[PDB]
Every structure is written in structure tokens, then in C-alpha cells.
mmCIF file of C-alpha atoms and ligand atoms in Angstrom:
data_model
loop_
_atom_site.group_PDB
_atom_site.id
_atom_site.type_symbol
_atom_site.label_atom_id
_atom_site.label_comp_id
_atom_site.label_asym_id
_atom_site.label_seq_id
_atom_site.Cartn_x
_atom_site.Cartn_y
_atom_site.Cartn_z
ATOM 1 C CA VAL A 37 43.421 155.056 136.665
ATOM 2 C CA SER A 38 43.612 152.077 134.191
ATOM 3 C CA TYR A 39 43.546 154.204 131.013
ATOM 4 C CA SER A 40 44.040 157.666 129.489
ATOM 5 C CA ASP A 41 42.534 159.270 126.404
ATOM 6 C CA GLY A 42 44.584 161.290 123.955
ATOM 7 C CA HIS A 43 44.443 162.712 120.473
ATOM 8 C CA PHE A 44 46.497 163.912 117.508
ATOM 9 C CA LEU A 45 45.736 166.447 114.800
ATOM 10 C CA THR A 46 46.475 165.703 111.165
ATOM 11 C CA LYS A 47 47.677 168.275 108.599
ATOM 12 C CA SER A 48 44.170 168.703 107.240
ATOM 13 C CA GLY A 49 42.863 169.302 110.767
ATOM 14 C CA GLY A 50 41.461 165.819 111.403
ATOM 15 C CA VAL A 51 41.391 164.409 114.959
ATOM 16 C CA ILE A 52 42.733 160.922 115.696
ATOM 17 C CA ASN A 53 41.408 159.809 119.066
ATOM 18 C CA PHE A 54 42.934 156.983 121.054
ATOM 19 C CA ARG A 55 42.710 155.284 124.443
ATOM 20 C CA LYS A 56 45.732 153.862 126.238
ATOM 21 C CA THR A 57 45.484 151.012 128.761
ATOM 22 C CA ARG A 58 48.463 150.221 131.024
ATOM 23 C CA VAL A 59 48.983 146.527 131.691
ATOM 24 C CA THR A 60 51.971 146.705 134.080
ATOM 25 C CA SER A 61 55.115 147.269 131.914
ATOM 26 C CA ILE A 62 53.185 147.503 128.595
ATOM 27 C CA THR A 63 50.572 149.892 127.226
ATOM 28 C CA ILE A 64 47.870 148.902 124.767
ATOM 29 C CA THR A 65 46.575 151.674 122.599
ATOM 30 C CA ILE A 66 43.305 151.454 120.701
ATOM 31 C CA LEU A 67 42.454 153.924 117.993
ATOM 32 C CA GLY A 68 39.063 155.509 117.548
ATOM 33 C CA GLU A 69 36.805 153.894 114.969
ATOM 34 C CA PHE A 70 35.884 155.226 111.548
ATOM 35 C CA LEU A 71 39.306 156.786 110.836
ATOM 36 C CA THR A 72 39.688 158.379 107.434
ATOM 37 C CA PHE A 73 42.731 160.267 106.182
ATOM 38 C CA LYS A 74 42.874 162.575 103.210
ATOM 39 C CA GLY A 75 45.779 162.651 100.712
ATOM 40 C CA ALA A 76 46.518 166.057 102.241
ATOM 41 C CA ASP A 77 47.349 164.336 105.559
ATOM 42 C CA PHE A 78 50.356 162.476 104.104
ATOM 43 C CA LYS A 79 53.887 163.835 103.719
ATOM 44 C CA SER A 80 53.516 162.690 100.142
ATOM 45 C CA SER A 81 50.132 161.722 98.723
ATOM 46 C CA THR A 82 51.648 159.331 96.177
ATOM 47 C CA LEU A 83 50.592 155.750 96.908
ATOM 48 C CA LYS A 84 54.079 154.584 97.822
ATOM 49 C CA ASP A 85 54.948 151.434 99.738
ATOM 50 C CA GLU A 86 55.789 153.581 102.784
ATOM 51 C CA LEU A 87 53.377 156.366 103.760
ATOM 52 C CA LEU A 88 53.969 158.992 106.429
ATOM 53 C CA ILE A 89 51.286 160.903 108.323
ATOM 54 C CA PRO A 90 52.733 163.733 110.373
ATOM 55 C CA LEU A 91 50.927 164.408 113.648
ATOM 56 C CA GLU A 92 50.576 167.129 116.249
ATOM 57 C CA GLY A 93 49.508 166.736 119.826
ATOM 58 C CA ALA A 94 50.493 166.719 123.472
ATOM 59 C CA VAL A 95 52.073 163.373 124.101
ATOM 60 C CA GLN A 96 54.318 161.151 122.066
ATOM 61 C CA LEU A 97 53.085 157.730 121.186
ATOM 62 C CA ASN A 98 55.773 155.195 120.216
ATOM 63 C CA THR A 99 54.497 151.711 119.269
ATOM 64 C CA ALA A 100 55.410 148.404 117.766
ATOM 65 C CA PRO A 101 53.793 147.760 114.326
ATOM 66 C CA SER A 102 50.209 146.480 114.064
ATOM 67 C CA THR A 103 48.242 145.042 111.181
ATOM 68 C CA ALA A 104 45.402 147.004 109.593
ATOM 69 C CA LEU A 105 42.972 146.494 106.786
ATOM 70 C CA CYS A 106 42.837 149.748 104.823
ATOM 71 C CA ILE A 107 41.010 151.057 101.859
ATOM 72 C CA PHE A 108 42.875 153.406 99.516
ATOM 73 C CA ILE A 109 40.751 155.502 97.195
ATOM 74 C CA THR A 110 42.513 157.027 94.233
ATOM 75 C CA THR A 111 40.951 158.883 91.284
ATOM 76 C CA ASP A 112 40.678 155.664 89.289
ATOM 77 C CA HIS A 113 40.727 152.778 91.803
ATOM 78 C CA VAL A 114 39.800 151.330 95.155
ATOM 79 C CA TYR A 115 42.467 149.195 96.843
ATOM 80 C CA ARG A 116 41.597 147.098 99.815
ATOM 81 C CA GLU A 117 44.819 145.901 101.479
ATOM 82 C CA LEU A 118 46.349 144.563 104.638
ATOM 83 C CA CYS A 119 49.075 146.991 105.767
ATOM 84 C CA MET A 120 51.230 147.443 108.816
ATOM 85 C CA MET A 121 51.026 150.660 110.860
ATOM 86 C CA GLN A 122 53.299 152.069 113.538
ATOM 87 C CA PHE A 123 53.528 155.226 115.628
ATOM 88 C CA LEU A 124 57.077 156.597 115.608
ATOM 89 C CA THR A 125 58.689 159.862 116.754
ATOM 90 C CA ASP A 126 61.057 161.688 114.393
ATOM 91 C CA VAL A 127 64.605 162.918 115.175
ATOM 92 C CA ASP A 128 63.010 166.402 115.418
ATOM 93 C CA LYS A 129 60.494 165.113 118.076
ATOM 94 C CA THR A 130 57.711 165.154 115.401
ATOM 95 C CA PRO A 131 55.251 162.238 115.914
ATOM 96 C CA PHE A 132 54.328 160.243 112.743
ATOM 97 C CA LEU A 133 51.952 157.426 111.898
ATOM 98 C CA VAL A 134 53.735 155.266 109.320
ATOM 99 C CA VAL A 135 51.813 152.951 106.997
ATOM 100 C CA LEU A 136 53.769 150.188 105.268
ATOM 101 C CA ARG A 137 52.351 148.561 102.166
ATOM 102 C CA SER A 138 53.336 145.800 99.696
ATOM 103 C CA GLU A 139 53.110 147.578 96.317
ATOM 104 C CA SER A 140 53.961 151.160 95.211
ATOM 105 C CA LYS A 141 51.540 152.678 92.705
ATOM 106 C CA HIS A 142 52.020 155.829 90.641
ATOM 107 C CA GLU A 143 48.695 157.200 91.819
ATOM 108 C CA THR A 144 47.627 159.930 94.222
ATOM 109 C CA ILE A 145 45.803 159.051 97.443
ATOM 110 C CA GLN A 146 42.415 160.751 97.767
ATOM 111 C CA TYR A 147 41.439 158.871 100.956
ATOM 112 C CA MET A 148 42.755 156.143 103.206
ATOM 113 C CA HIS A 149 40.120 154.491 105.393
ATOM 114 C CA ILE A 150 41.083 152.232 108.249
ATOM 115 C CA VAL A 151 38.544 149.370 108.209
ATOM 116 C CA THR A 152 39.969 147.603 111.244
ATOM 117 C CA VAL A 153 43.310 147.558 113.069
ATOM 118 C CA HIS A 154 44.871 145.397 115.777
ATOM 119 C CA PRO A 155 45.653 147.168 119.053
ATOM 120 C CA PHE A 156 49.000 148.911 119.335
ATOM 121 C CA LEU A 157 51.630 147.770 121.852
ATOM 122 C CA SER A 158 54.128 149.979 123.570
ATOM 123 C CA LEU A 159 56.750 148.718 126.056
ATOM 124 C CA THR A 160 57.025 151.493 128.686
ATOM 125 C CA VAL B 37 63.728 141.597 136.691
ATOM 126 C CA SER B 38 61.037 142.621 134.095
ATOM 127 C CA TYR B 39 62.897 141.254 131.045
ATOM 128 C CA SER B 40 65.645 138.937 129.767
ATOM 129 C CA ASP B 41 67.770 139.080 126.633
ATOM 130 C CA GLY B 42 68.488 136.030 124.520
ATOM 131 C CA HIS B 43 69.773 135.043 121.124
ATOM 132 C CA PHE B 44 69.775 132.335 118.456
ATOM 133 C CA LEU B 45 72.338 131.420 115.823
ATOM 134 C CA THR B 46 71.306 130.729 112.249
ATOM 135 C CA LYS B 47 72.925 128.122 109.962
ATOM 136 C CA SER B 48 75.035 130.771 108.273
ATOM 137 C CA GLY B 49 76.224 132.010 111.673
ATOM 138 C CA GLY B 50 73.905 135.016 111.973
ATOM 139 C CA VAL B 51 72.736 136.188 115.422
ATOM 140 C CA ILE B 52 69.047 136.845 116.106
ATOM 141 C CA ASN B 53 68.760 138.929 119.257
ATOM 142 C CA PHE B 54 65.560 139.246 121.239
ATOM 143 C CA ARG B 55 64.215 140.674 124.491
ATOM 144 C CA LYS B 56 61.487 138.986 126.510
ATOM 145 C CA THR B 57 59.152 140.904 128.838
ATOM 146 C CA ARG B 58 56.995 138.994 131.351
ATOM 147 C CA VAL B 59 53.536 140.453 131.870
ATOM 148 C CA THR B 60 52.215 138.071 134.562
ATOM 149 C CA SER B 61 51.127 134.832 132.766
ATOM 150 C CA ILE B 62 52.273 135.992 129.283
ATOM 151 C CA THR B 63 55.639 136.900 127.781
ATOM 152 C CA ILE B 64 56.113 139.430 125.006
ATOM 153 C CA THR B 65 59.151 138.920 122.866
ATOM 154 C CA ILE B 66 60.579 141.623 120.631
ATOM 155 C CA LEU B 67 63.130 140.818 117.985
ATOM 156 C CA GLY B 68 66.191 142.901 117.278
ATOM 157 C CA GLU B 69 65.901 145.345 114.396
ATOM 158 C CA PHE B 70 67.497 145.080 110.974
ATOM 159 C CA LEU B 71 67.142 141.278 110.704
ATOM 160 C CA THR B 72 68.316 139.765 107.450
ATOM 161 C CA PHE B 73 68.431 136.065 106.622
ATOM 162 C CA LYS B 74 70.346 134.453 103.808
ATOM 163 C CA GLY B 75 68.951 131.623 101.632
ATOM 164 C CA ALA B 76 71.545 129.478 103.410
ATOM 165 C CA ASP B 77 69.656 130.001 106.699
ATOM 166 C CA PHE B 78 66.538 128.163 105.465
ATOM 167 C CA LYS B 79 65.956 124.406 105.521
ATOM 168 C CA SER B 80 65.129 124.876 101.869
ATOM 169 C CA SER B 81 65.968 128.104 100.058
ATOM 170 C CA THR B 82 63.126 127.687 97.558
ATOM 171 C CA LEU B 83 60.550 130.454 97.984
ATOM 172 C CA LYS B 84 57.807 128.135 99.190
ATOM 173 C CA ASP B 85 54.653 129.170 101.015
ATOM 174 C CA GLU B 86 56.112 127.737 104.242
ATOM 175 C CA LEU B 87 59.733 128.548 105.110
ATOM 176 C CA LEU B 88 61.730 127.049 107.963
ATOM 177 C CA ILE B 89 64.733 128.633 109.668
ATOM 178 C CA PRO B 90 66.477 126.224 112.005
ATOM 179 C CA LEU B 91 67.979 127.826 115.107
ATOM 180 C CA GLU B 92 70.527 127.083 117.799
ATOM 181 C CA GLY B 93 70.737 128.614 121.220
ATOM 182 C CA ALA B 94 70.251 128.199 124.943
ATOM 183 C CA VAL B 95 66.566 128.568 125.552
ATOM 184 C CA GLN B 96 63.510 127.499 123.645
ATOM 185 C CA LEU B 97 61.153 130.151 122.460
ATOM 186 C CA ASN B 98 57.611 128.980 121.639
ATOM 187 C CA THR B 99 55.220 131.694 120.381
ATOM 188 C CA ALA B 100 51.890 132.370 118.805
ATOM 189 C CA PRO B 101 52.118 133.681 115.188
ATOM 190 C CA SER B 102 52.793 137.370 114.488
ATOM 191 C CA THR B 103 52.510 139.440 111.344
ATOM 192 C CA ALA B 104 55.617 140.729 109.578
ATOM 193 C CA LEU B 105 56.370 142.747 106.511
ATOM 194 C CA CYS B 106 59.249 141.024 104.721
ATOM 195 C CA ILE B 107 61.279 141.604 101.659
ATOM 196 C CA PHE B 108 62.374 138.562 99.651
ATOM 197 C CA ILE B 109 65.237 139.083 97.237
ATOM 198 C CA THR B 110 65.667 136.467 94.559
ATOM 199 C CA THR B 111 68.038 136.549 91.568
ATOM 200 C CA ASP B 112 65.374 138.146 89.386
ATOM 201 C CA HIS B 113 62.860 139.825 91.734
ATOM 202 C CA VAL B 114 62.083 141.730 94.890
ATOM 203 C CA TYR B 115 58.912 140.688 96.728
ATOM 204 C CA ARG B 116 57.542 142.821 99.478
ATOM 205 C CA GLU B 117 54.908 140.833 101.400
ATOM 206 C CA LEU B 118 53.003 140.546 104.624
ATOM 207 C CA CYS B 119 53.757 137.128 106.158
ATOM 208 C CA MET B 120 53.092 135.404 109.433
ATOM 209 C CA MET B 121 55.993 134.224 111.614
ATOM 210 C CA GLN B 122 56.097 131.882 114.584
ATOM 211 C CA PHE B 123 58.732 130.364 116.852
ATOM 212 C CA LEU B 124 58.153 126.627 117.273
ATOM 213 C CA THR B 125 60.187 123.756 118.752
ATOM 214 C CA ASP B 126 60.579 120.538 116.750
ATOM 215 C CA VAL B 127 59.883 116.965 117.959
ATOM 216 C CA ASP B 128 63.700 116.641 118.222
ATOM 217 C CA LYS B 129 63.849 119.755 120.532
ATOM 218 C CA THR B 130 65.256 121.820 117.590
ATOM 219 C CA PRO B 131 63.956 125.441 117.689
ATOM 220 C CA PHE B 132 62.669 126.855 114.337
ATOM 221 C CA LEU B 133 61.405 130.197 113.102
ATOM 222 C CA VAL B 134 58.630 129.431 110.611
ATOM 223 C CA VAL B 135 57.568 131.963 107.981
ATOM 224 C CA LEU B 136 54.189 131.446 106.319
ATOM 225 C CA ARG B 137 53.468 133.111 103.003
ATOM 226 C CA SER B 138 50.571 133.343 100.505
ATOM 227 C CA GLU B 139 52.207 132.264 97.221
ATOM 228 C CA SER B 140 54.883 129.629 96.401
ATOM 229 C CA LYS B 141 57.392 130.670 93.743
ATOM 230 C CA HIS B 142 59.875 128.456 91.911
ATOM 231 C CA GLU B 143 62.725 130.777 92.810
ATOM 232 C CA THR B 144 65.638 130.624 95.232
ATOM 233 C CA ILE B 145 65.800 133.005 98.195
ATOM 234 C CA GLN B 146 68.964 135.118 98.258
ATOM 235 C CA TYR B 147 67.836 137.260 101.224
ATOM 236 C CA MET B 148 64.827 137.739 103.449
ATOM 237 C CA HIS B 149 64.718 141.081 105.260
ATOM 238 C CA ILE B 150 62.295 141.702 108.076
ATOM 239 C CA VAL B 151 61.077 145.301 107.620
ATOM 240 C CA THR B 152 58.851 145.302 110.688
ATOM 241 C CA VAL B 153 57.157 142.660 112.843
ATOM 242 C CA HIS B 154 54.521 142.702 115.578
ATOM 243 C CA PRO B 155 55.684 141.532 119.009
ATOM 244 C CA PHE B 156 55.530 137.820 119.728
ATOM 245 C CA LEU B 157 53.244 136.414 122.439
ATOM 246 C CA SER B 158 53.924 133.370 124.522
ATOM 247 C CA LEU B 159 51.538 132.026 127.194
ATOM 248 C CA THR B 160 53.822 130.720 129.984
ATOM 249 C CA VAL C 37 41.944 130.781 138.099
ATOM 250 C CA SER C 38 44.158 132.289 135.296
ATOM 251 C CA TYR C 39 42.031 131.009 132.387
ATOM 252 C CA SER C 40 38.646 129.642 131.279
ATOM 253 C CA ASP C 41 37.696 127.377 128.394
ATOM 254 C CA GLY C 42 34.683 128.024 126.206
ATOM 255 C CA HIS C 43 33.168 127.011 122.913
ATOM 256 C CA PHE C 44 30.805 128.040 120.119
ATOM 257 C CA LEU C 45 28.721 125.980 117.720
ATOM 258 C CA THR C 46 28.617 126.794 114.027
ATOM 259 C CA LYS C 47 25.539 126.426 111.784
ATOM 260 C CA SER C 48 26.776 123.100 110.466
ATOM 261 C CA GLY C 49 27.276 121.859 114.032
ATOM 262 C CA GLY C 50 31.039 122.402 114.251
ATOM 263 C CA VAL C 51 32.656 123.230 117.618
ATOM 264 C CA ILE C 52 35.067 126.159 117.951
ATOM 265 C CA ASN C 53 37.033 125.741 121.162
ATOM 266 C CA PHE C 54 38.912 128.570 122.816
ATOM 267 C CA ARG C 55 40.837 129.399 125.983
ATOM 268 C CA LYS C 56 40.742 132.819 127.616
ATOM 269 C CA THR C 57 43.580 134.150 129.789
ATOM 270 C CA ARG C 58 43.012 137.246 131.960
ATOM 271 C CA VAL C 59 46.002 139.562 132.195
ATOM 272 C CA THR C 60 44.609 142.192 134.604
ATOM 273 C CA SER C 61 42.333 144.523 132.536
ATOM 274 C CA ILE C 62 42.749 142.557 129.256
ATOM 275 C CA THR C 63 41.853 139.035 128.161
ATOM 276 C CA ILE C 64 43.796 137.051 125.589
ATOM 277 C CA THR C 65 41.829 134.439 123.752
ATOM 278 C CA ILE C 66 43.451 131.611 121.823
ATOM 279 C CA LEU C 67 41.468 129.505 119.417
ATOM 280 C CA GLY C 68 41.746 125.756 119.142
ATOM 281 C CA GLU C 69 43.994 124.460 116.381
ATOM 282 C CA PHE C 70 42.952 122.819 113.133
ATOM 283 C CA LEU C 71 39.831 124.976 112.625
ATOM 284 C CA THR C 72 37.917 124.336 109.434
ATOM 285 C CA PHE C 73 34.647 125.973 108.426
ATOM 286 C CA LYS C 74 32.281 124.795 105.743
ATOM 287 C CA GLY C 75 30.510 127.144 103.286
ATOM 288 C CA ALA C 76 27.368 126.180 105.206
ATOM 289 C CA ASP C 77 28.779 127.930 108.305
ATOM 290 C CA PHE C 78 28.732 131.381 106.659
ATOM 291 C CA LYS C 79 25.764 133.749 106.453
ATOM 292 C CA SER C 80 26.564 133.803 102.765
ATOM 293 C CA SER C 81 28.936 131.272 101.226
ATOM 294 C CA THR C 82 29.976 133.634 98.427
ATOM 295 C CA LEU C 83 33.661 134.531 98.731
ATOM 296 C CA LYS C 84 33.023 138.181 99.521
ATOM 297 C CA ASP C 85 35.501 140.597 101.062
ATOM 298 C CA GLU C 86 33.548 140.426 104.342
ATOM 299 C CA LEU C 87 32.452 137.008 105.622
ATOM 300 C CA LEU C 88 30.173 136.363 108.582
ATOM 301 C CA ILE C 89 30.060 133.191 110.672
ATOM 302 C CA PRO C 90 27.115 133.155 113.044
ATOM 303 C CA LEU C 91 27.772 131.429 116.366
ATOM 304 C CA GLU C 92 25.873 129.916 119.264
ATOM 305 C CA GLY C 93 27.114 129.376 122.765
ATOM 306 C CA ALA C 94 27.015 130.433 126.390
ATOM 307 C CA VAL C 95 29.175 133.494 126.633
ATOM 308 C CA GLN C 96 29.759 136.432 124.365
ATOM 309 C CA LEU C 97 33.227 137.010 123.087
ATOM 310 C CA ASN C 98 33.971 140.544 121.842
ATOM 311 C CA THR C 99 37.508 141.112 120.490
ATOM 312 C CA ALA C 100 39.745 143.461 118.617
ATOM 313 C CA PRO C 101 40.749 142.195 115.117
ATOM 314 C CA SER C 102 43.608 139.706 114.690
ATOM 315 C CA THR C 103 45.527 138.558 111.648
ATOM 316 C CA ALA C 104 45.089 135.040 110.285
ATOM 317 C CA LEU C 105 46.448 133.035 107.424
ATOM 318 C CA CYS C 106 43.510 131.201 105.853
ATOM 319 C CA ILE C 107 42.986 128.810 103.052
ATOM 320 C CA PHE C 108 39.792 129.140 101.008
ATOM 321 C CA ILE C 109 38.806 126.136 98.936
ATOM 322 C CA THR C 110 36.309 126.750 96.180
ATOM 323 C CA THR C 111 35.183 124.320 93.459
ATOM 324 C CA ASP C 112 37.884 125.570 91.101
ATOM 325 C CA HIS C 113 40.604 127.176 93.263
ATOM 326 C CA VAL C 114 42.660 127.268 96.419
ATOM 327 C CA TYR C 115 43.345 130.728 97.861
ATOM 328 C CA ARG C 116 45.891 131.171 100.564
ATOM 329 C CA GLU C 117 45.489 134.647 102.094
ATOM 330 C CA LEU C 118 46.206 136.804 105.085
ATOM 331 C CA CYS C 119 42.874 138.026 106.503
ATOM 332 C CA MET C 120 41.728 139.834 109.595
ATOM 333 C CA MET C 121 39.271 138.174 111.998
ATOM 334 C CA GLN C 122 37.204 139.590 114.834
ATOM 335 C CA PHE C 123 34.587 138.336 117.277
ATOM 336 C CA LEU C 124 31.637 140.734 117.436
ATOM 337 C CA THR C 125 28.142 140.577 118.963
ATOM 338 C CA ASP C 126 25.146 141.600 116.842
ATOM 339 C CA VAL C 127 22.402 144.109 117.781
ATOM 340 C CA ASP C 128 20.221 141.014 118.419
ATOM 341 C CA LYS C 129 22.858 139.612 120.896
ATOM 342 C CA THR C 130 23.933 137.036 118.229
ATOM 343 C CA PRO C 131 27.722 136.374 118.387
ATOM 344 C CA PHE C 132 29.570 136.392 115.000
ATOM 345 C CA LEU C 133 33.092 135.682 113.821
ATOM 346 C CA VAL C 134 33.797 138.160 111.019
ATOM 347 C CA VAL C 135 36.507 137.515 108.432
ATOM 348 C CA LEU C 136 37.732 140.487 106.404
ATOM 349 C CA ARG C 137 39.518 139.897 103.125
ATOM 350 C CA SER C 138 41.149 141.986 100.356
ATOM 351 C CA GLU C 139 39.382 140.730 97.207
ATOM 352 C CA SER C 140 35.760 139.635 96.529
ATOM 353 C CA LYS C 141 35.399 136.650 94.203
ATOM 354 C CA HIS C 142 32.233 135.395 92.523
ATOM 355 C CA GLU C 143 32.831 131.897 93.835
ATOM 356 C CA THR C 144 31.261 129.746 96.534
ATOM 357 C CA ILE C 145 33.260 128.773 99.621
ATOM 358 C CA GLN C 146 33.517 125.010 100.123
ATOM 359 C CA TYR C 147 35.952 125.265 103.067
ATOM 360 C CA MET C 148 37.877 127.877 104.990
ATOM 361 C CA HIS C 149 40.839 126.528 106.957
ATOM 362 C CA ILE C 150 42.599 128.634 109.536
ATOM 363 C CA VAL C 151 46.324 127.847 109.150
ATOM 364 C CA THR C 152 47.449 130.120 111.966
ATOM 365 C CA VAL C 153 46.013 133.137 113.790
ATOM 366 C CA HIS C 154 47.377 135.705 116.236
ATOM 367 C CA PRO C 155 45.801 135.682 119.701
ATOM 368 C CA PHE C 156 42.663 137.736 120.201
ATOM 369 C CA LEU C 157 42.596 140.716 122.582
ATOM 370 C CA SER C 158 39.628 141.880 124.559
ATOM 371 C CA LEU C 159 39.665 144.911 126.894
ATOM 372 C CA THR C 160 37.411 143.915 129.831
HETATM 373 CL CL1 CL D 1 54.348 167.153 105.529
HETATM 374 CL CL1 CL D 2 53.808 159.824 102.664
HETATM 375 CL CL1 CL D 3 48.973 142.948 114.417
HETATM 376 CL CL1 CL D 4 46.181 159.255 90.819
HETATM 377 CL CL1 CL D 5 68.613 122.577 107.544
HETATM 378 CL CL1 CL D 6 62.511 126.338 104.251
HETATM 379 CL CL1 CL D 7 50.347 140.224 114.522
HETATM 380 CL CL1 CL D 8 65.755 131.808 91.667
HETATM 381 CL CL1 CL D 9 22.865 132.602 108.640
HETATM 382 CL CL1 CL D 10 29.148 135.610 104.939
HETATM 383 CL CL1 CL D 11 47.301 140.402 114.623
HETATM 384 CL CL1 CL D 12 32.210 128.645 93.068
#
């Protein structure tokens, strides 16, 4: 009764698992560990300062932003960075995970690994 | 009954809106979107590694720190940075929003835009 | 009844105080202010991108990661950085505070000061 599990599918067919815990008027969502995204999962694979991961699945998830430590692997480099992440729903009802970064690079993302991320808050 | 709205005024006459949600012994405060501060809103407009925004308004707000992604516009540059922010009350009862940054610059702030910020926690 | 106080000891004999607040199924832990660690407190004092602080004390603390602003003093430099921190328990039941950073440096930590840190969440 405390929690529910859910998931999303990425464009490349990856599964993002999460668990939601209701704490009265708020919900805390924790993502599954060892999450890795391919460049193919992003709307654009360019390593921009705003990245969009379109999602599919059964239930919307709309959150405040949370801090993550991510690793971005490009052909030539490895970038280890604190980023902010947020689950948002599009005007077309399409769920997205948005990743906000400090510095745009003219490089293509091969992988993004989430090392660790703070729990996500939603105000229900 | 769950929440209350409040606001602060900045030195330049800007309005910071917020909504507070009580979750038993804690309060979660969410700031209004699209917040932009002028250099004139800071105690000092120099782009120091600690920035202070003095506030006026009806009710104190004292919080733990939260992470934000901010944009700092100076005459010559645009800096997009993760920062920590915290609402604190001064020894004189003056409320402040404090912004803590990584790197002091000898430049004057024209604008600070909050792109996104994690909710603020207070332990009541 | 709302809270409990606890502490850990560091290798150099420093005391980390904390206060835990239960909010139904979650616990919020706030660390004592003015925390300073010596290089001697780390498993390795090299300024790596993952730092481990072994702890002793009466009660495990297992948390999600939280953002901190830290100052790292080395012989030659002062680094002011946002980092993520997390309390984890080892396979041997040894509690650790882990600090995750962006950039490894081939320098020895003299001190790490926590300037400010977001509260820690545990899902009980
Ligand atoms: Cl797409
Ligand atoms: Cl994108
Ligand atoms: Cl966060
Ligand atoms: Cl590339
Ligand atoms: Cl002033
Ligand atoms: Cl200032
Ligand atoms: Cl935060
Ligand atoms: Cl300037
Ligand atoms: Cl050790
Ligand atoms: Cl270490
Ligand atoms: Cl955090
Ligand atoms: Cl050194």
C-alpha cells in the first residue's frame, strides 16, 4: 500500500524501473540502479546543455528537478558531471526525462550513465 | 489546509512567489517559475562565490540548502552553473536568499536566472 | 518521539553528529554544521573522484545521495566544488560516507570542509 513500481521504455528499448512512495501529499520516486542510456535514446544525441529522453509507458511521472552525477561517453572523451534531471510531460502527453547540463559540446553522446541521483519529488 | 502561498520583495521591487506544503513535521517549499534577479537585487553585484539577496515580506522562511541550475549574465559572459541556494534569516531578523557558487569572478552580475531548482526543505 | 540524535567517529577521532526525523515511511537526516574532515579520515587521501570515509558508531545509516558544496584543501590549492554524498554500509557491515566528485587530481587531501549539504533521505 505504501509504494508502487512502474517502468518506462526508451527509444532503444531500454527499461527504466522506478518505485514510488507516497508520503501523504507528496510522492518520492527512486530510480532503479545501474541506469545507462544510449545516444539513440535522446531526441538529439548531440551533447547539448539540455538533453531530452522521450519515454513510453503506462503512467505519467511529473517531478521537481533532482541532482545526478552522470558520466557522458563520447567517441573521444569521458565527462563526469553533476547535472539536474526532471520528469516532465509534453503538450502531446509524451513523457520525457530532461537532463540539464552546464556546458554544450559539439560531440555525439555514445552513452550516459547515471552514477547516483537524489530521489525525485512529486507534489500530488 | 495542506499548503500556503507567500511572497518576498527584492530590492529592485521584484516578487518571489512560493508555495509551502506541510508534510507532518517538515515543510516543502516550491518557488515560482521563471525567476530572474537583477544585479541590483544582490547585497553586492560582484560575481562572488557567495551571493546574498536581501528580502522583505511577511513571514520568515528558513530552509536547508537546495541545488539549482542558474544562468549568470555579465556584460561579457554567460555562465551556466549548478549552485546551492538557501533561505536564511539574519541576526537582525532580515530574510536572505543565499546563493553559493564554486568560482568567484571579478565581474558584475547583470542578471541571474534560475533555470530549475530542487524543492526547499524546512524542519518545523 | 519525532527525532533521534546519533553520531559517528572518524579514523582521526572526529565526531560527526546528526539528527534523524521520521516522516512516516521516510527518515530525513541532517548533519551537524561546521564539518571538517582530515586527509587521515579517508580510506585514501588522494583527491580521487570517489572518496571513502570509514565510520564507527552504534547505528547504521543508509541514505540516498545528497548534494553538498565542499572545500578541498591540498598543499597547493583550494577547490570549491559541488559533490554528491551518500551514507552506505559495506559488505562487512562497516558504515562509510562516500563523496563523489567530477575530477580526479593527483594531490593529497589535507582537509575537506562541508560548506552546506542538502538533507539526507532514507526510505525505512
Ligand atoms: Cl525522438
Ligand atoms: Cl536531446
Ligand atoms: Cl537534488
Ligand atoms: Cl562526437
Ligand atoms: Cl543590500
Ligand atoms: Cl551579494
Ligand atoms: Cl537539492
Ligand atoms: Cl563585469
Ligand atoms: Cl581506512
Ligand atoms: Cl578515499
Ligand atoms: Cl540533493
Ligand atoms: Cl598534494
